[PDB]
Amino acid sequence: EADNQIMGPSSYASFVVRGENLVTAVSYGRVMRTFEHFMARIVDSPEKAG
Amino acid sequence: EADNQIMGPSSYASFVVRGENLVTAVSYGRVMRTFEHFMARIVDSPEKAG
Amino acid sequence: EGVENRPFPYLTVDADLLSNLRQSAAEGLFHSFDLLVGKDAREAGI
């Protein structure tokens, strides 16, 4: 074996439906994975080409 | 006539697709009217019924 | 019949819009409405 052990995450990552996501789950029935990056690339900095 | 004039509004009560409804207009194509009041009702203290 | 039933935050107006309602929905003044009697009258699942 070229190695004995590997690193890696100890916990599962958390996707909790926060405020923008809770409202569009309640009202439209649709959640996005990141409302925060959708805000940051539509309404906060739209011309910033990623 | 008891009165000759009435006291009414002077301008249209405007409504624009702001930062919270732009994400769902571009993303889903479902705008709601007063997204901030939906957030005030179900995110910020949903235990206070109106 | 063209109506969604989601757990919306419903604004609580004070209008007297109960008057002549169960007879008006029967004749068809409303183009699309849902009658929820019993367990269906619930703030539905999200």
mmCIF file with all atom_site columns, C-alpha atoms in Angstrom:
data_model
loop_
_atom_site.group_PDB
_atom_site.id
_atom_site.type_symbol
_atom_site.label_atom_id
_atom_site.label_alt_id
_atom_site.label_comp_id
_atom_site.label_asym_id
_atom_site.label_entity_id
_atom_site.label_seq_id
_atom_site.pdbx_PDB_ins_code
_atom_site.Cartn_x
_atom_site.Cartn_y
_atom_site.Cartn_z
_atom_site.occupancy
_atom_site.B_iso_or_equiv
_atom_site.pdbx_formal_charge
_atom_site.auth_seq_id
_atom_site.auth_comp_id
_atom_site.auth_asym_id
_atom_site.auth_atom_id
_atom_site.pdbx_PDB_model_num
ATOM 1   C CA . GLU A 1 1  ? 0.000   0.000  0.000   1.00 0.00 ? 1  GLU A CA 1
ATOM 2   C CA . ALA A 1 2  ? 1.406   3.371  -1.014  1.00 0.00 ? 2  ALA A CA 1
ATOM 3   C CA . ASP A 1 3  ? -0.420  4.898  1.954   1.00 0.00 ? 3  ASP A CA 1
ATOM 4   C CA . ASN A 1 4  ? -2.085  3.654  5.126   1.00 0.00 ? 4  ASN A CA 1
ATOM 5   C CA . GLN A 1 5  ? -4.892  6.179  5.622   1.00 0.00 ? 5  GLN A CA 1
ATOM 6   C CA . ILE A 1 6  ? -6.528  9.173  3.959   1.00 0.00 ? 6  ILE A CA 1
ATOM 7   C CA . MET A 1 7  ? -8.035  12.381 5.253   1.00 0.00 ? 7  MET A CA 1
ATOM 8   C CA . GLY A 1 8  ? -11.599 13.444 4.550   1.00 0.00 ? 8  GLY A CA 1
ATOM 9   C CA . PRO A 1 9  ? -14.560 15.126 6.214   1.00 0.00 ? 9  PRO A CA 1
ATOM 10  C CA . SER A 1 10 ? -15.739 14.068 9.644   1.00 0.00 ? 10 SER A CA 1
ATOM 11  C CA . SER A 1 11 ? -19.300 15.365 9.334   1.00 0.00 ? 11 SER A CA 1
ATOM 12  C CA . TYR A 1 12 ? -21.980 15.656 6.694   1.00 0.00 ? 12 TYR A CA 1
ATOM 13  C CA . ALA A 1 13 ? -22.417 19.114 5.229   1.00 0.00 ? 13 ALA A CA 1
ATOM 14  C CA . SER A 1 14 ? -25.605 20.934 6.169   1.00 0.00 ? 14 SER A CA 1
ATOM 15  C CA . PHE A 1 15 ? -28.182 22.188 3.682   1.00 0.00 ? 15 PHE A CA 1
ATOM 16  C CA . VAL A 1 16 ? -30.845 23.821 5.851   1.00 0.00 ? 16 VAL A CA 1
ATOM 17  C CA . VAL A 1 17 ? -33.706 25.695 4.184   1.00 0.00 ? 17 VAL A CA 1
ATOM 18  C CA . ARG A 1 18 ? -33.193 29.233 5.501   1.00 0.00 ? 18 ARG A CA 1
ATOM 19  C CA . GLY A 1 19 ? -35.405 32.323 5.034   1.00 0.00 ? 19 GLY A CA 1
ATOM 20  C CA . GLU A 1 20 ? -35.486 32.914 1.236   1.00 0.00 ? 20 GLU A CA 1
ATOM 21  C CA . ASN A 1 21 ? -35.799 29.121 0.791   1.00 0.00 ? 21 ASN A CA 1
ATOM 22  C CA . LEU A 1 22 ? -38.493 28.698 3.443   1.00 0.00 ? 22 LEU A CA 1
ATOM 23  C CA . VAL A 1 23 ? -40.648 31.394 1.831   1.00 0.00 ? 23 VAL A CA 1
ATOM 24  C CA . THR A 1 24 ? -40.365 29.911 -1.652  1.00 0.00 ? 24 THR A CA 1
ATOM 25  C CA . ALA A 1 25 ? -40.998 26.439 -0.226  1.00 0.00 ? 25 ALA A CA 1
ATOM 26  C CA . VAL A 1 26 ? -44.143 27.692 1.515   1.00 0.00 ? 26 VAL A CA 1
ATOM 27  C CA . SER A 1 27 ? -45.448 29.906 -1.277  1.00 0.00 ? 27 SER A CA 1
ATOM 28  C CA . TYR A 1 28 ? -44.218 28.459 -4.583  1.00 0.00 ? 28 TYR A CA 1
ATOM 29  C CA . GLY A 1 29 ? -43.220 24.938 -3.581  1.00 0.00 ? 29 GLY A CA 1
ATOM 30  C CA . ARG A 1 30 ? -39.671 25.260 -4.902  1.00 0.00 ? 30 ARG A CA 1
ATOM 31  C CA . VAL A 1 31 ? -36.299 25.563 -3.162  1.00 0.00 ? 31 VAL A CA 1
ATOM 32  C CA . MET A 1 32 ? -32.933 26.538 -4.601  1.00 0.00 ? 32 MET A CA 1
ATOM 33  C CA . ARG A 1 33 ? -29.662 25.094 -3.356  1.00 0.00 ? 33 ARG A CA 1
ATOM 34  C CA . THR A 1 34 ? -28.186 28.536 -2.665  1.00 0.00 ? 34 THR A CA 1
ATOM 35  C CA . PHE A 1 35 ? -30.443 31.553 -2.435  1.00 0.00 ? 35 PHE A CA 1
ATOM 36  C CA . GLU A 1 36 ? -27.413 33.505 -1.219  1.00 0.00 ? 36 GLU A CA 1
ATOM 37  C CA . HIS A 1 37 ? -25.286 32.965 -4.320  1.00 0.00 ? 37 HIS A CA 1
ATOM 38  C CA . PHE A 1 38 ? -28.333 33.569 -6.517  1.00 0.00 ? 38 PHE A CA 1
ATOM 39  C CA . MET A 1 39 ? -28.739 36.902 -4.729  1.00 0.00 ? 39 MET A CA 1
ATOM 40  C CA . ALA A 1 40 ? -25.014 37.636 -5.039  1.00 0.00 ? 40 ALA A CA 1
ATOM 41  C CA . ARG A 1 41 ? -25.098 36.952 -8.795  1.00 0.00 ? 41 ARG A CA 1
ATOM 42  C CA . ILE A 1 42 ? -28.475 38.499 -9.716  1.00 0.00 ? 42 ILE A CA 1
ATOM 43  C CA . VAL A 1 43 ? -29.193 41.441 -7.424  1.00 0.00 ? 43 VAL A CA 1
ATOM 44  C CA . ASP A 1 44 ? -25.878 42.233 -5.691  1.00 0.00 ? 44 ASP A CA 1
ATOM 45  C CA . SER A 1 45 ? -23.343 41.992 -8.544  1.00 0.00 ? 45 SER A CA 1
ATOM 46  C CA . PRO A 1 46 ? -24.959 41.040 -11.857 1.00 0.00 ? 46 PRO A CA 1
ATOM 47  C CA . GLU A 1 47 ? -22.300 42.419 -14.203 1.00 0.00 ? 47 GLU A CA 1
ATOM 48  C CA . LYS A 1 48 ? -19.507 40.555 -12.377 1.00 0.00 ? 48 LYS A CA 1
ATOM 49  C CA . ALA A 1 49 ? -18.948 37.699 -14.811 1.00 0.00 ? 49 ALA A CA 1
ATOM 50  C CA . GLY A 1 50 ? -18.073 34.663 -12.729 1.00 0.00 ? 50 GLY A CA 1
ATOM 51  C CA . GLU B 1 1  ? -73.660 68.803 -2.594  1.00 0.00 ? 1  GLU B CA 1
ATOM 52  C CA . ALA B 1 2  ? -72.462 68.528 0.997   1.00 0.00 ? 2  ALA B CA 1
ATOM 53  C CA . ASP B 1 3  ? -68.858 68.693 -0.251  1.00 0.00 ? 3  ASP B CA 1
ATOM 54  C CA . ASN B 1 4  ? -67.394 69.777 -3.573  1.00 0.00 ? 4  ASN B CA 1
ATOM 55  C CA . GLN B 1 5  ? -64.109 67.877 -3.352  1.00 0.00 ? 5  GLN B CA 1
ATOM 56  C CA . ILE B 1 6  ? -62.764 64.594 -1.987  1.00 0.00 ? 6  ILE B CA 1
ATOM 57  C CA . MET B 1 7  ? -59.322 63.868 -0.562  1.00 0.00 ? 7  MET B CA 1
ATOM 58  C CA . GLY B 1 8  ? -57.652 61.228 -2.698  1.00 0.00 ? 8  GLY B CA 1
ATOM 59  C CA . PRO B 1 9  ? -54.148 60.023 -3.536  1.00 0.00 ? 9  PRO B CA 1
ATOM 60  C CA . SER B 1 10 ? -51.806 61.941 -5.800  1.00 0.00 ? 10 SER B CA 1
ATOM 61  C CA . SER B 1 11 ? -49.665 59.192 -7.346  1.00 0.00 ? 11 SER B CA 1
ATOM 62  C CA . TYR B 1 12 ? -49.832 55.534 -8.279  1.00 0.00 ? 12 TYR B CA 1
ATOM 63  C CA . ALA B 1 13 ? -48.792 53.227 -5.442  1.00 0.00 ? 13 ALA B CA 1
ATOM 64  C CA . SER B 1 14 ? -45.842 51.778 -7.332  1.00 0.00 ? 14 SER B CA 1
ATOM 65  C CA . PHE B 1 15 ? -44.505 48.219 -7.241  1.00 0.00 ? 15 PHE B CA 1
ATOM 66  C CA . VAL B 1 16 ? -41.168 47.131 -8.707  1.00 0.00 ? 16 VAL B CA 1
ATOM 67  C CA . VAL B 1 17 ? -39.545 43.702 -8.900  1.00 0.00 ? 17 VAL B CA 1
ATOM 68  C CA . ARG B 1 18 ? -36.929 44.281 -6.193  1.00 0.00 ? 18 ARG B CA 1
ATOM 69  C CA . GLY B 1 19 ? -34.013 42.176 -4.987  1.00 0.00 ? 19 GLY B CA 1
ATOM 70  C CA . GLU B 1 20 ? -36.019 39.366 -3.406  1.00 0.00 ? 20 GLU B CA 1
ATOM 71  C CA . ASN B 1 21 ? -38.532 38.893 -6.244  1.00 0.00 ? 21 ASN B CA 1
ATOM 72  C CA . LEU B 1 22 ? -35.923 39.244 -8.989  1.00 0.00 ? 22 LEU B CA 1
ATOM 73  C CA . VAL B 1 23 ? -34.389 35.939 -7.897  1.00 0.00 ? 23 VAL B CA 1
ATOM 74  C CA . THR B 1 24 ? -37.716 34.152 -8.266  1.00 0.00 ? 24 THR B CA 1
ATOM 75  C CA . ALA B 1 25 ? -38.630 36.007 -11.457 1.00 0.00 ? 25 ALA B CA 1
ATOM 76  C CA . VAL B 1 26 ? -35.381 35.000 -13.161 1.00 0.00 ? 26 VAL B CA 1
ATOM 77  C CA . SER B 1 27 ? -35.252 31.613 -11.394 1.00 0.00 ? 27 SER B CA 1
ATOM 78  C CA . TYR B 1 28 ? -38.877 30.426 -11.254 1.00 0.00 ? 28 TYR B CA 1
ATOM 79  C CA . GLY B 1 29 ? -41.017 33.015 -12.985 1.00 0.00 ? 29 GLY B CA 1
ATOM 80  C CA . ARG B 1 30 ? -43.219 33.560 -9.935  1.00 0.00 ? 30 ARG B CA 1
ATOM 81  C CA . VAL B 1 31 ? -43.218 37.010 -8.354  1.00 0.00 ? 31 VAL B CA 1
ATOM 82  C CA . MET B 1 32 ? -45.239 37.678 -5.231  1.00 0.00 ? 32 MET B CA 1
ATOM 83  C CA . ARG B 1 33 ? -46.494 41.040 -4.032  1.00 0.00 ? 33 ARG B CA 1
ATOM 84  C CA . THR B 1 34 ? -44.715 42.183 -0.834  1.00 0.00 ? 34 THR B CA 1
ATOM 85  C CA . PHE B 1 35 ? -42.156 39.422 -0.403  1.00 0.00 ? 35 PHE B CA 1
ATOM 86  C CA . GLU B 1 36 ? -40.991 41.298 2.707   1.00 0.00 ? 36 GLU B CA 1
ATOM 87  C CA . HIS B 1 37 ? -44.370 40.736 4.340   1.00 0.00 ? 37 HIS B CA 1
ATOM 88  C CA . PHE B 1 38 ? -44.223 37.001 3.592   1.00 0.00 ? 38 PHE B CA 1
ATOM 89  C CA . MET B 1 39 ? -40.779 36.988 5.210   1.00 0.00 ? 39 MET B CA 1
ATOM 90  C CA . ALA B 1 40 ? -42.180 38.991 8.127   1.00 0.00 ? 40 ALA B CA 1
ATOM 91  C CA . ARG B 1 41 ? -45.000 36.489 8.566   1.00 0.00 ? 41 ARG B CA 1
ATOM 92  C CA . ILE B 1 42 ? -43.320 33.072 8.237   1.00 0.00 ? 42 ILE B CA 1
ATOM 93  C CA . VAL B 1 43 ? -39.602 33.661 8.871   1.00 0.00 ? 43 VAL B CA 1
ATOM 94  C CA . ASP B 1 44 ? -39.474 36.405 11.502  1.00 0.00 ? 44 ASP B CA 1
ATOM 95  C CA . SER B 1 45 ? -41.719 34.972 14.265  1.00 0.00 ? 45 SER B CA 1
ATOM 96  C CA . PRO B 1 46 ? -44.148 32.589 12.511  1.00 0.00 ? 46 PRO B CA 1
ATOM 97  C CA . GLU B 1 47 ? -45.675 31.876 15.941  1.00 0.00 ? 47 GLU B CA 1
ATOM 98  C CA . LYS B 1 48 ? -47.377 35.305 15.921  1.00 0.00 ? 48 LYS B CA 1
ATOM 99  C CA . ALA B 1 49 ? -50.570 34.795 13.928  1.00 0.00 ? 49 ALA B CA 1
ATOM 100 C CA . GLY B 1 50 ? -51.963 37.937 12.358  1.00 0.00 ? 50 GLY B CA 1
ATOM 101 C CA . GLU C 2 1  ? -59.931 23.606 -10.349 1.00 0.00 ? 1  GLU C CA 1
ATOM 102 C CA . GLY C 2 2  ? -57.170 26.132 -11.002 1.00 0.00 ? 2  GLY C CA 1
ATOM 103 C CA . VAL C 2 3  ? -56.437 26.790 -7.346  1.00 0.00 ? 3  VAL C CA 1
ATOM 104 C CA . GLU C 2 4  ? -53.416 25.872 -5.236  1.00 0.00 ? 4  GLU C CA 1
ATOM 105 C CA . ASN C 2 5  ? -53.598 25.052 -1.526  1.00 0.00 ? 5  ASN C CA 1
ATOM 106 C CA . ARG C 2 6  ? -50.260 25.841 0.116   1.00 0.00 ? 6  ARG C CA 1
ATOM 107 C CA . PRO C 2 7  ? -49.623 26.954 3.716   1.00 0.00 ? 7  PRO C CA 1
ATOM 108 C CA . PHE C 2 8  ? -49.567 30.636 2.711   1.00 0.00 ? 8  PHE C CA 1
ATOM 109 C CA . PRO C 2 9  ? -49.470 33.401 5.289   1.00 0.00 ? 9  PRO C CA 1
ATOM 110 C CA . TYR C 2 10 ? -53.005 34.620 4.732   1.00 0.00 ? 10 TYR C CA 1
ATOM 111 C CA . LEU C 2 11 ? -53.593 38.294 5.482   1.00 0.00 ? 11 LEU C CA 1
ATOM 112 C CA . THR C 2 12 ? -56.578 38.692 7.786   1.00 0.00 ? 12 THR C CA 1
ATOM 113 C CA . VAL C 2 13 ? -58.948 41.262 6.297   1.00 0.00 ? 13 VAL C CA 1
ATOM 114 C CA . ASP C 2 14 ? -62.117 42.347 8.110   1.00 0.00 ? 14 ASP C CA 1
ATOM 115 C CA . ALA C 2 15 ? -64.565 42.301 5.196   1.00 0.00 ? 15 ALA C CA 1
ATOM 116 C CA . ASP C 2 16 ? -67.992 40.685 5.442   1.00 0.00 ? 16 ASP C CA 1
ATOM 117 C CA . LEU C 2 17 ? -67.357 38.355 2.513   1.00 0.00 ? 17 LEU C CA 1
ATOM 118 C CA . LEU C 2 18 ? -69.080 35.358 4.089   1.00 0.00 ? 18 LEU C CA 1
ATOM 119 C CA . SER C 2 19 ? -72.507 36.705 3.133   1.00 0.00 ? 19 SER C CA 1
ATOM 120 C CA . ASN C 2 20 ? -74.151 34.628 0.372   1.00 0.00 ? 20 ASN C CA 1
ATOM 121 C CA . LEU C 2 21 ? -71.110 32.449 -0.245  1.00 0.00 ? 21 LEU C CA 1
ATOM 122 C CA . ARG C 2 22 ? -72.206 28.809 -0.070  1.00 0.00 ? 22 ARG C CA 1
ATOM 123 C CA . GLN C 2 23 ? -75.038 29.634 -2.472  1.00 0.00 ? 23 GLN C CA 1
ATOM 124 C CA . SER C 2 24 ? -72.881 31.805 -4.740  1.00 0.00 ? 24 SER C CA 1
ATOM 125 C CA . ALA C 2 25 ? -70.287 29.064 -5.181  1.00 0.00 ? 25 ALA C CA 1
ATOM 126 C CA . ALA C 2 26 ? -73.067 26.626 -6.097  1.00 0.00 ? 26 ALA C CA 1
ATOM 127 C CA . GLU C 2 27 ? -74.435 28.732 -8.953  1.00 0.00 ? 27 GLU C CA 1
ATOM 128 C CA . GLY C 2 28 ? -70.979 29.504 -10.293 1.00 0.00 ? 28 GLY C CA 1
ATOM 129 C CA . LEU C 2 29 ? -70.024 33.099 -9.647  1.00 0.00 ? 29 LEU C CA 1
ATOM 130 C CA . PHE C 2 30 ? -66.490 31.836 -8.990  1.00 0.00 ? 30 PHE C CA 1
ATOM 131 C CA . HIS C 2 31 ? -64.716 30.464 -12.054 1.00 0.00 ? 31 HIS C CA 1
ATOM 132 C CA . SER C 2 32 ? -62.334 28.321 -9.993  1.00 0.00 ? 32 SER C CA 1
ATOM 133 C CA . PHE C 2 33 ? -62.630 27.473 -6.279  1.00 0.00 ? 33 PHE C CA 1
ATOM 134 C CA . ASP C 2 34 ? -61.877 24.588 -3.866  1.00 0.00 ? 34 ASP C CA 1
ATOM 135 C CA . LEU C 2 35 ? -64.293 23.620 -1.035  1.00 0.00 ? 35 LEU C CA 1
ATOM 136 C CA . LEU C 2 36 ? -62.420 22.021 1.870   1.00 0.00 ? 36 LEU C CA 1
ATOM 137 C CA . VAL C 2 37 ? -64.729 20.459 4.473   1.00 0.00 ? 37 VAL C CA 1
ATOM 138 C CA . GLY C 2 38 ? -63.518 18.352 7.389   1.00 0.00 ? 38 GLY C CA 1
ATOM 139 C CA . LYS C 2 39 ? -59.854 17.337 7.371   1.00 0.00 ? 39 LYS C CA 1
ATOM 140 C CA . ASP C 2 40 ? -59.133 19.129 4.084   1.00 0.00 ? 40 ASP C CA 1
ATOM 141 C CA . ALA C 2 41 ? -59.608 22.487 5.850   1.00 0.00 ? 41 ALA C CA 1
ATOM 142 C CA . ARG C 2 42 ? -56.013 22.529 7.053   1.00 0.00 ? 42 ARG C CA 1
ATOM 143 C CA . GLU C 2 43 ? -52.908 24.563 6.375   1.00 0.00 ? 43 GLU C CA 1
ATOM 144 C CA . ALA C 2 44 ? -51.521 21.938 4.048   1.00 0.00 ? 44 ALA C CA 1
ATOM 145 C CA . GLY C 2 45 ? -48.201 20.141 3.922   1.00 0.00 ? 45 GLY C CA 1
ATOM 146 C CA . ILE C 2 46 ? -45.180 22.085 2.714   1.00 0.00 ? 46 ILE C CA 1
#
